[PDB]
Design a protein around this nucleic acid. Structure first.
Lengths: 98, 106, 79, 93, 93, 106, 79, 98
DNA sequence: ATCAATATCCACCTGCAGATACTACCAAAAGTGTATTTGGAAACTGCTCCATCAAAAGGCATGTTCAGCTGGATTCCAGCTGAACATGCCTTTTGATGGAGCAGTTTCCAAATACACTTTTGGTAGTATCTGCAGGTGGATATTGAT
DNA sequence: ATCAATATCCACCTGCAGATACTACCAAAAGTGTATTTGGAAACTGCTCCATCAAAAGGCATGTTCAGCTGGAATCCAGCTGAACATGCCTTTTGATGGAGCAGTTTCCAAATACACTTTTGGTAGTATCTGCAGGTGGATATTGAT
């Protein structure tokens, strides 16, 4: 039975996704999330499809860049595993929540 | 009747730029030199990014510049990267980059 | 409860693009929390622009204007 | 009718890369770029005129705005193209 | 002539704390504050009208601008004060 | 002649705010209610900060509001602190705050 | 040198106000370098406003305008 | 011979400086720094007294806040001592470096 | 727990820098009356495109098993960084004089604005035919991991 | 190093969504030409305030000694988190339908601009007095730290 060691596939995945540009979150699920949040602010709203896509392109770009800063906080702590305190430290320094 | 772009030796539309300036309410008056200068700068910059993007397109064996090529050209250029540091290019992805410590063996 | 539509694999994938190799189990809920706050803020502003224009439909431009407001300028959708 | 810089971006593209095309999504990004830089430059120019109690925006305000907005090397070159186009335009008609 | 909000700030100070003074440096800070908020609010109303292809900045653009700029409660109250002053103004010879 | 500030029941100068909107090139036209609304919003915010700055001066056994007090009022208030999140108040100092991990073990 | 005029005790006092308890010996040089990039960025813009107005004196407003466009608004020095 | 333990006086310093608002860098040395830096953009420049002081309030307010972020990065790493890498990480995440 | 050395705090005091109360001058500003223009709300509606139903499918999510190796806990110790001094270099104050040049004011003309016309053009609606490359396929090459 | 399971590279190829080629129409853009109005460069310069000394003061920085305690290196191991596998659901795709609502064209008056005239005001300047509080001295007592 063949088995790659832990971390090998993860690295394979990194090269894979850093090489492509397609969205990583499923389309329809993201769409329902946007409609749910908007709805809690104002009922009877409609969305141009491109408005939903503009939101998904901004959201994914924001999360990817966030994970980069988070990776740097983990590494700063002698770790290779990101944790909630890494995300929290990256957002505090970013000024997203003093 | 030559176009003001022609008079200026520019590709970008000087008359349009002068018009957009007035419509934008940036000041009460817009001097005739303003749009010429501005159209030139805009042209220079789109030339700078298209130069680099066309290179990224060739390096990827492509003939058509797509968003990923614009992102590669911008993030790989110190200055364009700074000018567009708070800008997100749709479908651009990111630059291949893996922190050393994450690589296997020694 | 659509935030749970933002799946574990979708979050791992985003982390990989961000160059992350190992993920703690608590990261998925933390990330959903963060995404939600991000969307609430952008949609809130986008919808404010919608109502101001007296429309019932949120446009790409509303989102683009909301994003520029937050310093998250987006190129590609008429903005 | 909605305006776009497409035909102009396209002309410049053929000057720098004669056999290279550009997808519409990329052209859409280029158009957003030109609009964005136009506003940022016009904005600095605008404030620059006000801080000085000037009611007119001339090439001069546009020049300072470019120096304020662009990083070292892009500025130096941009300022040249601009001055060069103003000079040339001034010696015509 | 150098205009300043100093006097109207001083007036507002006495309604809130009749026996409290304020230093010159503090007054300067407050003046900076009113100027900043004016510019941020005016600027947003500006963009608002432009986006909707409008030539006029009404109190409606000022209201949305306030909603866009101020945090929750500050906004709720600022809107209340705003609507109130325009209401009282409309009812007066 | 009763001033517009008086009519709308305000301390802030409605006439000045009007004149300022026009000369700032924010739009070709400026409705009549705009400077009123805006003047009132500027006034309310001024009251909100002076009230809090006043309390801070009281809590420090002082009667004169100085920069320190405006800082304390602002940074100790969730909403104002966000509103002024990217503003530096000269001679304001910072809030007394020591990360707990640095305090004596005891 | 002038950047060396910004002393260790001053850098320490600054770090103290920042709630810092222990300081590495290499921090002082690191800090001087950061302070310098900061001032060059701000002064560069301040001076650019000075030259535009055809003055030979940097004014408080020049600095205030420079700080504002760098996203570091400063209250207290006019405007 | 009395002697305070390491950390006690520093903690005392923290409390003393977080109470006050005075500038912590010497004025004349700072003024010399500013004039020298400006000399590289435009020769023979004069400075209003208020310009320099504006430059000093902004710089100190900037260094102090950066020291707060640096401190959080040291602490994240399970340390109580700030190092150059703590400042670099804080600047990197802030968008001032990379 | 005791107890000496220091720091910290609170009550009160006074000198003075900075806040304040009065008088006077005045240009820019704010209100007021009036004739003229116009932005954009109304009302009507052409028509884009958003919401929604439908059926087929296989890409991809979910849940489990398993064990590799990472994080967390712990212990040890070299030496860095803090505290406390003795020294003395230079910041800070502040008086005061020159004089740079910011800021006020008169001029006056190149350049902008407003208006009237003609000519040019970029965006669009209708059709129609190329082409760069995404994605499938087969197989040669390269990477990884057990031995 | 050898060796076998798997991923990875790429040449080959075709389907087609997307890019491209063109004739047509055309309202808005853009340029030409006047007559008219004016913003702000230009020169002269008064007076604000910036650069400069001079100079005892002594605050505060710098060099040195000692050792407390923190950072970083090294050890161990429970169990988290990655890799692989089976099962099957729900997202993706193709697509046609009704119609909400975004947007185009026209009608028109409530509210804005442009002036002109009168009046009210906030800012600049003096000139003179008033006061909150910074900074100094006490004495109390809380804190730190050796025993």
């Amino acid at each position: 039975p063949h088995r790659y060691r832990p971390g090998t596939v993860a690295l394979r995945e990194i090269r894979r996704y850093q090489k492509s540009t397609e969205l990583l979150i499923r389309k329809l699920p993201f769409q329902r999330l946007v409609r749910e949040i908007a709805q809690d602010f104002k009922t009877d709203l409609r969305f141009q499809s491109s408005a939903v896509m503009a939101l998904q392109e901004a959201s994914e770009a924001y999360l990817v860049a966030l994970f980069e800063d988070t990776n740097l906080c983990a590494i700063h702590a002698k770790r290779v595993t990101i944790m909630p305190k890494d995300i929290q430290l990256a957002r505090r320094i970013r000024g997203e929540r003093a | 009747a030559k176009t003001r772009s022609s008079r200026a030796g520019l590709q970008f539309p000087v008359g349009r730029v002068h018009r957009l300036l007035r419509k934008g309410n940036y000041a009460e008056r817009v001097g005739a030199g303003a749009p010429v200068y501005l159209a030139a700068v805009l042209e220079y910059l789109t030339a700078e990014i298209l130069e680099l993007a066309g290179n990224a397109a060739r390096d990827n064996k492509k003939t058509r510049i797509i968003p990923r090529h614009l992102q590669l050209a911008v993030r790989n250029d110190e200055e364009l990267n700074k000018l567009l540091g708070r800008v997100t290019i749709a479908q651009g992805g990111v630059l291949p980059n893996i922190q050393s410590v994450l690589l296997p063996k020694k | 409860d659509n935030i749970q539509g933002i799946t574990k694999p979708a979050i791992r994938r985003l982390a990989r693009r961000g160059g992350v190799k190992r993920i703690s189990g608590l990261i998925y809920e933390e990330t959903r929390g963060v995404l939600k706050v991000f969307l609430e803020n952008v949609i809130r502003d986008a919808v404010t622009y919608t109502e101001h224009a007296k429309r019932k439909t949120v446009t790409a431009m509303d989102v683009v204007y909301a994003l520029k407001r937050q310093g998250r300028t987006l190129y590609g959708f008429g903005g | 009718r909605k305006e776009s810089y497409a035909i102009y971006v396209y002309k410049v593209l053929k000057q720098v890369h004669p056999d290279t095309g550009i997808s519409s999504k990329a052209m859409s990004i280029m158009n957003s770029f030109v609009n964005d830089v136009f506003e940022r430059i016009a904005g600095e120019a605008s404030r620059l005129a006000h801080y000085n109690k000037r009611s007119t925006i001339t090439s001069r305000e546009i020049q300072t705005a470019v120096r304020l907005l662009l990083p070292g090397e892009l500025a130096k070159h941009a300022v040249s193209e601009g001055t060069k186009a103003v000079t040339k335009y001034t010696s015509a008609k």
